[PDB]
Design a protein around this ligand. Structure first.
Ligand SMILES: [Mg+2]
Ligand SMILES: [Mg+2]
Length: 315
């Protein structure tokens, strides 16, 4: 996401100081994280005997239990319906290139079949099936999840602002742009220590408003305007913001500036979800993990036993 890291205040926090907090996990960010970091010695992903990747299932299972063991109650947040994701104020223009220039012409020729074998790949190793399988596993584990109307980071941020959860868990800083009061990094990955970023601290320290921060992100470049504004990094953007000339510059330099701003300010969110935990289906977990995905029975068994006890106590 936006490379805010070096320019915003952040603090290393211990796992103990995270004890008892409820958090909204950015599901897609977490799953991509697992695929990247849960690999073999040769950098190859974890797979079952059928050659299917299980890296994501490994992180979902073990990472979720790790948090619960430390009294951190997670609620997984996933992205909305790929076909339709227009988030309340997110339909005016596009969510891709469907409406506008996407090219309609007869080209079924070989270049279309080598291509008709060239569409299921850029969806990375994280396929809808895999994402669906992760949702299934969370269900068996008794862990609550929400399917956001659109971007999961907006849903999670909303949940944090509401106070249903203490922070958004992700490796990206982007939740701050949606008004998330707190983001906690390095929980799904522990190379480095957990890192807590508080939005209010960032704003007070930099002496800027949330709208200013969104402006800086747009200069740098968001998923909605990759590459940002020609030759402008954090410092120059922050300079333009403090001078009070950012909004004029952005209106000139970024088409759909007002549209991009609305995405962060008025996303489509939902209140239909529960943070309640359910006792885990031990047998179904073992079938899916051990039987169908070749996880080690012993380790899995000890873990579903631990999971059940934790939830029971919590419940
Ligand atoms: Mg992002
Ligand atoms: Mg996202």
């Amino acid at each position: 996401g936006v490379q805010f890291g070096d320019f915003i205040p952040k603090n290393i926090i211990s796992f103990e100081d995270l004890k008892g907090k409820k958090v909204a996990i950015d599901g897609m960010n977490a799953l991509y994280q697992f695929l990247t970091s849960i690999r073999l010695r040769d950098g190859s992903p974890l797979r079952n005997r059928k050659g299917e990747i299980t890296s994501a299932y490994n992180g979902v299972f073990y990472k979720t239990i790790h948090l619960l063991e430390n009294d951190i109650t997670p609620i997984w947040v996933f992205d909305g319906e790929p076909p339709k994701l227009k988030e309340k104020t997110r339909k005016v223009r596009r969510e891709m290139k469907e409406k506008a220039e996407l090219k309609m012409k007869e080209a079924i020729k070989k270049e279309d079949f080598e291509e008709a074998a060239k569409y299921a790949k850029r969806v990375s190793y994280l396929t809808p099936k895999m994402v669906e399988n992760c949702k299934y596993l969370l269900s068996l584990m008794g862990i609550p999840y929400v399917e956001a109307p659109s971007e999961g980071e907006a849903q999670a941020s909303y949940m944090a602002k509401k106070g249903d959860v203490w922070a958004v868990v992700s490796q990206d800083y982007d939740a701050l742009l949606y008004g998330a009061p707190r983001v906690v990094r390095n929980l799904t990955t522990t190379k480095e220590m957990p890192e807590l970023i508080e939005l209010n601290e960032v704003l007070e320290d930099l002496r800027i408003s949330l709208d200013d921060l969104i402006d800086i992100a747009i200069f740098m470049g968001t998923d909605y305007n990759p590459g940002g504004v020609k030759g402008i990094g954090f410092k120059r953007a922050y300079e333009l913001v403090r001078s009070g000339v950012a909004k004029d510059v952005l209106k000139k330099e970024v088409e759909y500036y007002d549209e991009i701003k609305r995405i962060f300010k008025e996303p489509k969110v939902t209140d239909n979800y529960s943070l309640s935990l359910k006792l885990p289906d031990k047998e179904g977990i073992i079938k899916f993990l051990v039987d169908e995905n070749d996880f080690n029975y012993d380790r899995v068994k000890k873990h579903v036993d631990k999971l059940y006890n934790l939830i029971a106590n919590k419940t």
